[PDB]
Amino acid sequence: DSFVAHFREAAPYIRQMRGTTLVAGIDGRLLEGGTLNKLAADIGLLSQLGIRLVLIHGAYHFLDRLAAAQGRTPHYCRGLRVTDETSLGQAQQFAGTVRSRFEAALCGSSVPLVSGNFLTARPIGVIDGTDMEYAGVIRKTDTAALRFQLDAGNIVWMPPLGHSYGGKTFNLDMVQAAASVAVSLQAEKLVYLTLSDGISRPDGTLAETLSAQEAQSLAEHAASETRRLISSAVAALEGGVHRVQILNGAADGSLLQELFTRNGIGTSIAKEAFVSIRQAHSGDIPHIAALIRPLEEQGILLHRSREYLENHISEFSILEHDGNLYGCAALKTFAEADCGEIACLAVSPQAQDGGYGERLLAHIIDKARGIGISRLFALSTNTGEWFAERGFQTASEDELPETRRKDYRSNGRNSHILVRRLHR
Amino acid sequence: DSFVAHFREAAPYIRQMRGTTLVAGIDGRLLEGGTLNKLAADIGLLSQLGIRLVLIHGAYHFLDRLAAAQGRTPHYCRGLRVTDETSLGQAQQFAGTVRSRFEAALCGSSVPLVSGNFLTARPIGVIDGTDMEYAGVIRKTDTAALRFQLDAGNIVWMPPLGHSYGGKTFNLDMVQAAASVAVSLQAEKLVYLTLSDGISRPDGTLAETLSAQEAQSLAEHAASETRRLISSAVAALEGGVHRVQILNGAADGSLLQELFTRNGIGTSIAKEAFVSIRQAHSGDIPHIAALIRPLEEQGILLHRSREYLENHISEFSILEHDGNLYGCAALKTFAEADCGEIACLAVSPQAQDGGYGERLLAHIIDKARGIGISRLFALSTNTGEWFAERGFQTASEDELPETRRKDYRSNGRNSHILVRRLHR
Amino acid sequence: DSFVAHFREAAPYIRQMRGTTLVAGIDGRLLEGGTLNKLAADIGLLSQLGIRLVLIHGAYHFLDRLAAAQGRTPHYCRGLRVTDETSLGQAQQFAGTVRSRFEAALCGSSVPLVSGNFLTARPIGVIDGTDMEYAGVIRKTDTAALRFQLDAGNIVWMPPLGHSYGGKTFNLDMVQAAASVAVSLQAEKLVYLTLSDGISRPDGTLAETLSAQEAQSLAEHAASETRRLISSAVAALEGGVHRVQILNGAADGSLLQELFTRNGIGTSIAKEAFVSIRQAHSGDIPHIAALIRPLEEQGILLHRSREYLENHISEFSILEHDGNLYGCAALKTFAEADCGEIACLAVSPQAQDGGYGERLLAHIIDKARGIGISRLFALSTNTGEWFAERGFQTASEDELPETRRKDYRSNGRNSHILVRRLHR
Amino acid sequence: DSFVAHFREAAPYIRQMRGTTLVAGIDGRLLEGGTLNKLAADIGLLSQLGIRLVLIHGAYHFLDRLAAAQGRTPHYCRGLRVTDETSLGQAQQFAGTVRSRFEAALCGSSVPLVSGNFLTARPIGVIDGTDMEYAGVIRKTDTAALRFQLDAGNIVWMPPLGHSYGGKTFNLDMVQAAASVAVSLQAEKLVYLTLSDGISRPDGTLAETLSAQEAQSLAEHAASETRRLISSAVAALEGGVHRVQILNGAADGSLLQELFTRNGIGTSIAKEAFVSIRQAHSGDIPHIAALIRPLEEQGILLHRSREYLENHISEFSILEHDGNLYGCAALKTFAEADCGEIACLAVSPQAQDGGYGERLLAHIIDKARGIGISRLFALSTNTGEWFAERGFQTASEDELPETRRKDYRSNGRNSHILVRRLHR
């Protein structure tokens, strides 16, 4: 397409990404060669697009090569690496080489880059009988110092190294560190830059999007490498991060493509908090009634007698929290086998605005999809826009199922009519 | 002495040092061993005393050992080192090791420490036929980014490395870099931390204090090592820095002793700008007259006829700038061979407050010292405090030379009498 | 010792004191003579060390002398003074004299000093039948205006005077005022500057440190003078202040010695909040189990069957809040009569970080000290550092009691071994 | 009038006064009695109207009464008072009493009030043979600390007391101090609050407005009391202050009446900088030409041949600076003896905007007033608004002098016509 078509395509993603915080976990293989130069170009750019960036890099792969080649053999317990005083020594050397290459890569294509003593570490200790030695975990993250720099527009660079109150230095696992830091910053996005195109489903495909549950179900049959990833991503998500993404840092431009296109190569994981939605039974009726009466009192909902409710209960779904009822919604069917109706959609004013609306709308869309329903209607006097903004086209009365066009004319309400098409 | 006697001793030096900027050039030998731990302790402390700190470290000595040992031979032109792509490589490694050791040393005895891409470098190029290669000089110092961090209370750490617009990295001479950076920050103090107790005079003594002239006169007969130091110190001073100091980083506590004691081990260099002070001759008389008439008009100065001036001209010193007369002062002598008087001390209101007063007072103190004068008097109606604050004790009339006690009683002025003792 | 030994000694105390707020209650006797000049020197210094200072002074002793001498007799009810319109009058005069002397004392050895209308007062009213008249208490403290000035680095000076909405002025008791103000600022330190070396124990010794309980037990048999002190200190502590201290303002340098030495002359009082720690009995077992199972599930704790627990319950201490169990810890004994072991140390993740750990560690240290135990061991896989940072030296297996060295080899865990020596 | 008529009257004065700085020199007699309460009410109000307030008070009158009554006799040299250690002592007492009364007066009718060590003083020394002793002058004003508090909205209170580097305290003359401080703050207004209705002209009237010249001409025949006032006011004005005012603090509401009414009781002094305006002669013609040609080139001015200029030179006034010509303007006369015209009004673009326009307009208004001219016309194509905003009503051609109505129709320009009536 044209340049102008591409920029207008990314525009909405720039608007979202702007002022948000993005923490990037970089495999250290990427920080060597023609790949490092392009990584800095796109990162440079992100800075320019006003995204607050935190960058941590890995070292395991360097170390592990320095080892084998120089005689010794690296050893890993429960995923984590044993790092001896000498591994630690060269981990510090590597960090100074990578920070410096990157810095140069960034001036070769202004942008301001900062590092500090932001991380304090304790030793992992002993795992399954094995002393890990200089393997550490982040004990304290200087979250104020971080935000202070990000506020200033500076790119934050972090080696896989934190220090202890005792004057020792520890080697940190990039993947767990990226996740920790991100959760401290309550960052909106954690991005792991790997050498893989993402996380594959069992059928060898690339899982474009995943839930933290779907992801967790993939880990059982998965390489231990991507097992630890998933666990850190799932940990991040639970800890606050809005979205974590896995990309191939070796795929030229992938970072730009992931962030500013609709489709975006690579895989993204998010956690949709659990809300309990279930078929209504005889007992919710007093609750549902309690919820909808005020509404039908205001003339927003059509009146629904307890009796009606008693013999129409199966059309109803209720959304609950701790046995409390906070929402409901009904799917109506018709002679026309394609049509459905979302009816009696209500969330209590106190639990409003938390996304419950959406969740009941979705829920009955799956119900309606299960029974071969393609067109789904919604009539309302004072809430049509909500539907407009969620996949609905205003409709005409002559386009309703016959029975509903007839209630429509008797009503005397003139509610607005909106339809949405449900797909295969 | 007691703890309380020591703290009260340092108190005035803390008051001066506070909020001022101090740039420290560290020999990299200091960043290894039990010496690094104590360096960080005292630096940690300085941070706590509210001194803005910038820290750059050297690498030549590491490199040069890595070289010889590993076969190769280092080479230096006009003081500067030839650093090849491989020297550069390990200079980056060293920097990552030293920054990290220091960081740990600082947590083992909270304090916030920051580094950035503050320096942009160009290659030195070719010197006397020799390609220097990866030897660079600071082309641009990010002075805003620096001040921004110092304002935040952060300690700034800088490796001897800056980058180019071309994506290359260059090795910087710590000593020249420290001086450049300091001059950009217009820092009040540059401190070089060496392995020597300072700069020795020809007589093998340690030159406690020096002027940028005295220092420059020492460089001719001096080791090339301390030659480059002096030139960087003298360059700093000319460029703005108020004071540069040379200490032995290996002398435990020297840094604290230099900054917060009266005497302070090690050597300090400062530049006193040039002001021309000379004996008056026949021609200054209209100028001097012009200067002092307003004053004697106000009754601050005793009246001095042109005639008086004509046959007393040799008592007079004048302070001038571009042939312009901005001050004057007279030394009076007496039957009493010990006594002098500072008389007719005046600086034009326009050039007042720049220290001219001081300079004429000093000047005639050297005159008065040259002719065996120990007690120096000063009488005035409205300016006695100035003298109080500069080494003067209020005196009684019965303590003046006889002739002056007699003018004193006739006068009818009752001017205040202050004396100051001049020494061997 | 050397200057350098003294500065490095105070360094940790400067680091703590920095940015913290210190409110000083000054007996007004100190504000007269050679003692006032040194008080300002050390206060000047504190300002320079970045401590936020609030200074309130007393007046009772002046007033009371002005009285008797000028005929009249002062009278005090429940500790507080009756101040009549004329006492009030001269209390305002004194305040203007003391503020001004201090100000001068501070310029004679830059530092910025501010006073305002920060205090609004109501009358105390009538006490035990007696009209107190112009005796007031602080009704409102302008806490925002205060912080605003302290933020600016200014020293805050406050007379023992506050005003009313009615346009009257009241005399405030310095001691209660200092405590009130401090509690408003939630200051980390309240310091009373008296004419006494502190608070004496019954045996005529100077109580170096006290708890707000120990202190309160001293007040019964104590001079009414120090009774009111204690009550204000205890009130401050309960109200938020971290530490209150009593010094002799007439003891030259005491203020510097109190704040920046380990030992520090004078007496300090602090409140350790109450946490209930008691021997475990049969009933805690399900709770303790609940607490430690997750841990032994993670392999952090060795497994402890309910049965074990049932016949080892007396080794156990539990830490509780409102009948809730939040921690536990066991002392193990051995054939070796000198040895103990802290075992099964656990605090629930929810009440973690509040210092509960410390409190159980301490607690069993007192238990272990009670039964002649000098060496106390602690083995763990993932928490050795905690012990390092609390008085523990890493140990070797060959140094455990025999039985424990044997479990150690069977275990197959290789936990880290740390010891700490308990004293007489 | 009505409340609404009064508020709308003051509105323009509130708009001017807002955000401006006002320094008030208060006679200390005002700070006692029912007069102090009302002074604080109106000052309180000023604070509320967003005027930055600095308040210094006097003490001479208190002292001088304390003296005589208690035996001793006060003595003054060149206006300034001899203040001995004991005068100084009670000057500090008075200051503490007045600050405190005022503070209370201000709470009896929220508003934030601050004092500090803002003033550093040196002794005046000896005057005409007399030791002044504790008479001081402000040597340094902490101008940053002041602005910092004013920025915060705080009312600044200053006693007539400043300190020395030597730890001494000096008595300051309120009147000279107010003027100094004001000039440091470059305050827009200095206000002296006296016990007099202002400064009287020789004819015993109250001089409503004065120039710093008119004022200075009144001082020769004036009481020494008001002599020193005038000199301080004139000194303030020269030093930057836009306006200084003298009021009677004992006249209830005078302060409000002075600041927020058109007329305002009491007397105000301002300095109109000197600009040289004189009749043109033969020599300015090339200059005037140079000035107006560009303009008549643009068609803003009617063309005026050198010849015209040569025989019309007496109609011309020129405004000059250092022999440079920066403006000109011509007064035209007519058969109609009442009419004038401002013609050929021009200021060079470089010296534009400095008020030169105004000054030439005024100047020829005085010329035109001198020769019996009441109506003054001004025609222009592109600058009519300037005249509208300076006392001019748009006019019709039929209202011009006949000759000018005739040039008007030939012109073919249709310039705008504005008139202004000049009075007796």
Ligand SMILES: CC(C)(COP(=O)(O)OP(=O)(O)OC[C@H]1O[C@@H](n2cnc3c(N)ncnc32)[C@H](O)[C@@H]1OP(=O)(O)O)[C@@H](O)C(=O)NCCC(=O)NCCSCC(=O)N[C@@H](CCC(=O)O)C(=O)O
């Ligand atoms: C609209 C409801 C369901 C959204 O709940 P909830 O807040 O949990 O969902 P949500 O968090 O996903 O959406 C929140 C956002 O929607 C927006 N929103 C809320 N009410 C809106 C409205 N009336 N118009 C536009 N936007 C609205 C909010 O501004 C909020 O904005 P944001 O995205 O944060 O910028 C909730 O406000 C509610 O229960 N309102 C009262 C009930 C109601 O209006 N029901 C009508 C549904 S249409 C179908 C229906 O029930 N019809 C009737 C009869 C009508 C007839 O036939 O004439 C019947 O069946 O009996």
Ligand SMILES: CC(C)(COP(=O)(O)OP(=O)(O)OC[C@H]1O[C@@H](n2cnc3c(N)ncnc32)[C@H](O)[C@@H]1OP(=O)(O)O)[C@@H](O)C(=O)NCCC(=O)NCCSCC(=O)N[C@@H](CCC(=O)O)C(=O)O
């Ligand atoms: C005092 C003079 C010399 C200082 O010049 P200059 O400003 O260049 O020196 P400086 O920069 O080193 O000092 C500046 C500082 O001194 C301070 N200062 C200036 N005048 C001061 C004063 N009168 N009192 C206290 N401090 C003063 C300034 O505040 C400034 O303060 P800072 O340190 O920045 O905080 C200058 O202000 C001046 O020329 N004043 C007028 C002349 C004058 O007062 N001469 C008296 C000298 S005593 C000897 C003398 O000439 N006596 C008479 C007769 C007297 C008799 O016998 O009765 C005679 O021989 O004829």
Ligand SMILES: CC(C)(COP(=O)(O)OP(=O)(O)OC[C@H]1O[C@@H](n2cnc3c(N)ncnc32)[C@H](O)[C@@H]1OP(=O)(O)O)[C@@H](O)C(=O)NCCC(=O)NCCSCC(=O)N[C@@H](CCC(=O)O)C(=O)O
């Ligand atoms: C470590 C515990 C006790 C501290 O509780 P609590 O937080 O209330 O105490 P606290 O507030 O005084 O200390 C908090 C500070 O300690 C630090 N901290 C917490 N865990 C740490 C760790 N693993 N390493 C270093 N520092 C740690 C925190 O960072 C915090 O830092 P801060 O001072 O605020 O900068 C708590 O985290 C906990 O219960 N962790 C899980 C239990 C555990 O690790 N127990 C091991 C104790 S060693 C003895 C033991 O029970 N051994 C086993 C078997 C072992 C074997 O023989 O192989 C047995 O007897 O069965």
Ligand SMILES: CC(C)(COP(=O)(O)OP(=O)(O)OC[C@H]1O[C@@H](n2cnc3c(N)ncnc32)[C@H](O)[C@@H]1OP(=O)(O)O)[C@@H](O)C(=O)NCCC(=O)NCCSCC(=O)N[C@@H](CCC(=O)O)C(=O)O
């Ligand atoms: C308008 C002149 C005189 C003001 O000089 P100056 O800047 O020194 O005075 P000022 O500082 O007191 O006033 C400055 C303020 O006036 C405002 N101002 C300047 N030009 C303005 C304009 N054309 N309209 C409205 N306001 C204007 C400025 O905005 C400034 O605003 P501020 O108060 O700071 O917010 C100056 O801009 C100038 O020389 N302009 C070019 C000459 C010009 O326009 N002369 C016309 C005067 S009317 C009389 C005249 O000379 N007529 C012709 C023929 C016309 C005919 O008969 O058709 C003749 O006799 O040959």
